[PDB]
Amino acid sequence: QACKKHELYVSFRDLGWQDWIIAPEGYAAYYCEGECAFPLNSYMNATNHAIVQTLVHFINPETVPKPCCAPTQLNAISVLYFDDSSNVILKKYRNMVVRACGCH
Amino acid sequence: QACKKHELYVSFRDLGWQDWIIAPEGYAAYYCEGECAFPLNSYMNATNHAIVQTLVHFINPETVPKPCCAPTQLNAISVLYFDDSSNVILKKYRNMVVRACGCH
Ligand SMILES: *[C@@H]1O[C@H](CO)[C@@H](O)[C@H](O)[C@H]1NC(C)=O
Ligand SMILES: *[C@@H]1O[C@H](CO)[C@@H](O)[C@H](O)[C@H]1NC(C)=O
């Protein structure tokens, strides 16, 4: 239940992009989820600011929430599609995949 | 109630650091909080991955949570303190202050 990376496959059919994409038919997108509380194991990649916020939360929970589990690194995907003039084009979409998460 | 930056002053006395710090007596730390849902106004600095995750959440909420509001930029502070041999030293602590937030 601690902050970590999870699996998530995204199908272009579910989003309604199947019409003009030639390949791939979907991709492994992943997602960050879980608690950012003590112990802030090093693997959880907390910043100094997160350590401070988690301590403040411990001292008076009304003053500030716990940090949130979020992506610390992302990578692009490339898709092959047909434009409106029937051209076949390769398009790069940046920040589409989660590679690592942390309490930031 | 949307994702934005908030005020948070942190006093070294509340954390028990007053013993050896010469200056300052605390600092403006800030914190990110709020919802990451449509509309993802541009000011909310969402990544492509967050847009995709928010859409997936809209299509079946059981599959994935909404993105979380987290810091996108942080700055260091410098403190003046007395070490165990009574030396006066200037120490820099990185990633201590939140400057901007987003749905990441
Ligand atoms: C924290 O970052 C490192 C990158 O060195 C990564 O390998 C690790 O998986 C990250 N932790 C989590 C929980 O995603
Ligand atoms: C999003 O990032 C920009 C930096 O260009 C920043 O000025 C803005 O305040 C950020 N938004 C929020 C809600 O913090």
Sign of CA dihedral B68, B69, B73, B77: negative
Structure-determination approach: X-ray
Q: What is the CA radius of gyration of chain A?
A: 19
CA distance B49 to A104: 17
Q: CB distance A47–B95 less than 8 Å?
A: yes
* Cis omega (within 30 of 0) for bond into A39: yes
CA distance B58 to A30: 17
Mutate to test the interface with A, among B1, B27, B31, B79 (most CBs of A within 10 A): B31
- B85, B66 Cβ separation under 8 angstroms: no
What residue type is B63 in one-letter code?
T
B101 CB within 6 A, ligand 2:
yes
Domains of chain A: 1-104 (2.10.90.10)
- The set of protein residues with a Cβ atom below 6 angstroms from ligand 1 is A 3-5, 43-45, 72, 100-102
B4 CB within 6 A, ligand 2:
yes
Structural resolution in Å: 2.0
Least CB-CB distance to B48: which of A52, A56, A93? A93
Distances (CA, A) of A20 to A23, A95, B51: 10, 21, 20
Paired residues of B77 in beta bridges: B93
Distances (CA, A) of B51 to A63, B29, B102: 30, 28, 12
Smallest Cα–Cα separation from A1: which of A74, A98, A69?
A: A69
Residue that is written with structure tokens 């990441």 in the block: B104
Least CB-CB distance to A49: which of B64, B65, B96? B96
What residue type is A74 in one-letter code?
L
B42 lies within 8 A of chain A by CB: no
Smallest Cα–Cα separation from A15: which of B46, B47, B53?
A: B53
